[PDB]
Amino acid sequence: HRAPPDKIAVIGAGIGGTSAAYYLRQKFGKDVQIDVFERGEVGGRLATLNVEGQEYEAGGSVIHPLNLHMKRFVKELGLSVSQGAGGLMGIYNGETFVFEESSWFIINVIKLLWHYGFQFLRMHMWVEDILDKFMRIYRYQSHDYAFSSVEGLLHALGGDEFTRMLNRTILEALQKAGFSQKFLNEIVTPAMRVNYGQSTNINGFVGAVSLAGADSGLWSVEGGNKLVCSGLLQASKARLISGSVTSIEEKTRTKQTGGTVKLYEVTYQTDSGTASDLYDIVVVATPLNRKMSNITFLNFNPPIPEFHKYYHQTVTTFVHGRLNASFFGYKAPDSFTDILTTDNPDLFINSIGVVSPVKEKGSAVWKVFSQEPLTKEQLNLLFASYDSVKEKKWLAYPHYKPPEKCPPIILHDRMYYLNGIEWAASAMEMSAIAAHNAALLAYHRWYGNTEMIDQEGLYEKLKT
Ligand SMILES: Cc1cc2nc3c(=O)[nH]c(=O)nc-3n(C[C@H](O)[C@H](O)[C@H](O)COP(=O)(O)OP(=O)(O)OC[C@H]3O[C@@H](n4cnc5c(N)ncnc54)[C@H](O)[C@@H]3O)c2cc1C
């Protein structure tokens, strides 16, 4: 038994930050002060963007059914789900379509059998086994077990298989599993491009998450994914502070009872000028690039270990206007919503797809993933006409460079960093798992419940 903490800072009003605030509240009780910093708008990558009067998801867009944190949250917050359908889908290689979906599902079955055989089925079954192991996390989190390291977490779910996938490229992985060069370049690679704007040179684990994201049932939050952030924030009853955190420094206190412990001074800038406050615990729920969150770490002993890592640029470009169906090879096209690309370096886009707005109400609204800002020439070559154009540059996810070691969860004595998780998978639910885990870990670390940390073979014992 020990003194419960007075103040906790959470840096970042992301889905990660606000999820932390929520779970912290659940572990430390109503008493503890929780402050969430946000230099920008709540939601971070779950922003929207106004296009001819309506809001569209510009960052985090869809949510899988096995995203239980987001499911439980939308339920608890009483938000509505925009579980819509989609449309038609094709893969372009820079000459023609290696594959196009038909209106008859049986046609599609036939096409995919001829072109790929059972590889469609076999990937499914390989992915299910990965997912199935991964779902163990919920049971462990519902029983409050924590993990000090993204690797250790994965190990606890899938054992060595999962830690080896992290160090493998999803290409290596699927070749070792006997998937064909054809299927890898025609199916798998486009999926990587659309999802993570990178090729099959990304973490096997990320990649398998990616491939479940072609599973069906998908949905989004009606009104914006970013509502989930503000909704949790409210429901956690944390104090939201608009300011760009600049610096974080250890100090020593003096508990009335002659204490001598280590606090963290967080300095942040606002309109008015500089301001600061002292915290017993810190959770960083933003990436630690100097381009993404300029926090300086002062007088630490020992120094925070190396989270130095780089994210990948993806530009979401929205266009109200009609496509150039002839730029993909149609001439007189009888009658055609999403185009994915193969890894052809003559292409300048990752994907291009008609979108619906967040609210629920040709020449329509399109969404273009590109590595770089689209030039006038490329917009013109892309669309016949366009009334309006909107574009956000998004350090969106890691530049997965396997083999590599995920950034720590523990930066210091009582300072935790959840965005390490991205290097296993960048997704909404992944931020939620990390936040949950980060909260548990901090709690167990504060109260010294070492029986609850880094416990292996949990699933067996927890299994009936
Ligand atoms: C283009 C795109 C598409 C995506 N599509 C999907 C998808 O289809 N499905 C899915 O599940 N996920 C998707 N994601 C991921 C989704 O956005 C998740 O939210 C993501 O894993 C975490 O992003 P975040 O900013 O919400 O969280 P975090 O990165 O954990 O939160 C970062 C927060 O910290 C704040 N911050 C930064 N610096 C400071 C500072 N100095 N002081 C205070 N606050 C600071 C930021 O403003 C932000 O709010 C997508 C992301 C992008 C960019």
Numbering used by the authors: 26 to 361, 364 to 388, 398 to 500
Question: What did the original publication write about this model?
Answer:
As they show high sequence identities with their human counterparts (78% and 88%, respectively) they were selected for experimental characterization as models to understand the human proteins. Reflecting its high stability and operability, PCYOX1 could be crystallized, and its structure was solved at 3.1 Å resolution using AlphaFold2-predicted coordinates as a search model. PCYOX1, a monomeric protein, is composed of two domains: the classical dinucleotide-binding domain with the Rossmann motif and a specific prenylcysteine-oxidase domain. The FAD prosthetic group is bound to the Rossmann fold in an extended conformation. Beside this overall similarity, PCYOX1 is distinguished by the presence of a wide and elongated tunnel-shaped cavity extending orthogonally from the flavin ring to the protein surface. Computational docking predicts that the substrate binds with the isoprenoid tail extended along the cavity towards its entrance. However, a large hydrophobic patch is located on the underside of the enzyme. An electron density peak on this surface region convincingly matches the shape of the sterolic head of CHAPS, the detergent used for crystallization. This region likely represents the site of association of PCYOX1 to the membrane and may act synergistically with the KTEL C-terminal sequence to retain the protein in the endoplasmic reticulum. Notably, the entrance to the substrate binding cavity is adjacent to this hydrophobic patch.
